[PDB]
Amino acid sequence: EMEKEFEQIDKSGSWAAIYQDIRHEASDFPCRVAKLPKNKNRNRYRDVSPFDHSRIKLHQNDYINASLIKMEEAQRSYILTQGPLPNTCGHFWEMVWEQKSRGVVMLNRVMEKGSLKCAQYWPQKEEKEMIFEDTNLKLTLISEDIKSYYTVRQLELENLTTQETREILHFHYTTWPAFGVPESPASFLNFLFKVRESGSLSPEHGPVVVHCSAGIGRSGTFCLADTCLLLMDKRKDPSSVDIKKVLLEMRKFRMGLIATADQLRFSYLAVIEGAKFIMGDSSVQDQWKELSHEDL
Amino acid sequence: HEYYR
């Protein structure tokens, strides 16, 4: 089916050739706001910026390194953003608020092979809530479900102005290395379906916010798999979804999505395995959970 | 460094 094209590329060993092609064919749009001097300290990497046409605007300086990926045919939107900086934690939650997101998926760790990939932007203790005074927000850990390779936290975001509050679900994947891949499709798809079940992806909410270190590599992998599985179901045809065309479509909205040839391969592996659920084998989901060893 | 490379 689609399992054809994968068995082929694996034998001929041409994954990097495929990946290099996407880099060549990918959109290239202006990033002028991101390159302004006043925004130098709001970008974590000098070669990773949001396109002007799809960048999120704070309702304030309105700049944040984050992009709205609006997949029209899949009928889902995501916001991909960089791991917040010490100075952009208030902007990040300002964004989450103004865009009405319900979920945040974080695929990196704050500490990653000695390198600091992210600021501690959410509170780790119920009793020590965070207050972001530049954006007038207050953030409180309410509860947390810790699993072997990921943690779900429940948070309360308070708009200190209006005093309204919202519940935000934080899904933190802790065993996904930079420029690397998850341990197995089951552990990934189990994670993805956890996020799906929470309702955080439902369209009555704003786009889910997805980030890693740069918001392009692991974040790209997570969003491509989810969208491919969405198109599988909508089109009602597994072997109809062409991962390459989908990834290029996502790259109209943010540069550099999917960071290694292996991450692209895993993307195929995950969509192929995920089709079992889409085709009707609704019970493969329980298989993924047991395979993922999420307990202890 | 501070390049994604």
Residue numbers in the entry:
A (entry chain A): 2 to 61, 64 to 299
B (entry chain D): 1159 to 1163
Question: Can I see the authors' text?
Answer:
Protein Tyrosine Phosphatase 1B (PTP1B) is the prototypical protein tyrosine phosphatase and plays an essential role in the regulation of several kinase-driven signalling pathways. Here we identify PTP1B as an inhibitor of IL-6 and show that, in vitro, it can dephosphorylate all four members of the JAK family. Dephosphorylation of substrate is initiated by nucleophilic attack by the active-site cysteine (Cys215) to form a phosphoenzyme intermediate followed by hydrolysis of the cysteinyl-phosphate to release free phosphate. Asp181 acts as both a proton donor, enabling protonation of the tyrosyl leaving group, and as a proton acceptor, receiving a proton from the water molecule that hydrolyzes the phosphoenzyme intermediate.
To determine the substrate-bound form of the D181A/Q262A double mutant we used the bisphosphorylated activation loop sequence of all four members of the JAK family as substrate peptides. Incorporation of the D181A/Q262A mutations leads to a five order-of-magnitude reduction in catalytic activity compared to WT PTP1B20. Nevertheless, in multiple co-substrate structures of this mutant, we observed that both steps of the reaction had occurred; dephosphorylation of the pTyr, presumably via the usual cysteinyl phosphate intermediate, as well as hydrolysis of that cysteinyl-phosphate. Surprisingly, the products of the phosphatase reaction (both the phosphate and the tyrosyl-peptide) were clearly visible in the active site in all four structures. The phosphate was not present as a cysteinyl-phosphate intermediate nor as the pTyr substrate but rather as free phosphate. This suggests that dephosphorylation had occurred within the crystal, as well as subsequent hydrolysis of the phosphoenzyme intermediate, but that neither the phosphate nor the tyrosyl-peptide product had completely diffused out of the active site. Accommodating both of these species within the active site necessitates a reorientation of both the tyrosine (back and across, towards solvent) and the phosphate (towards Q266, where it has displaced the water molecule W1 that Q266 coordinates) compared to previous structures. The occupancy of the phosphate was refined as ~60% suggesting that a proportion of it had left the active site but that the majority still remained. Our structure suggests that incorporation of the D181A/Q262A mutations have corrupted the usual catalytic cycle in which substrate is released prior to hydrolysis of the cysteine phosphate. In some of the JAK activation loop structures with the D181A/Q262A double mutant the register of the peptide in the active site is possibly scrambled, with populations of both the first and second tyrosines being present in the active site.
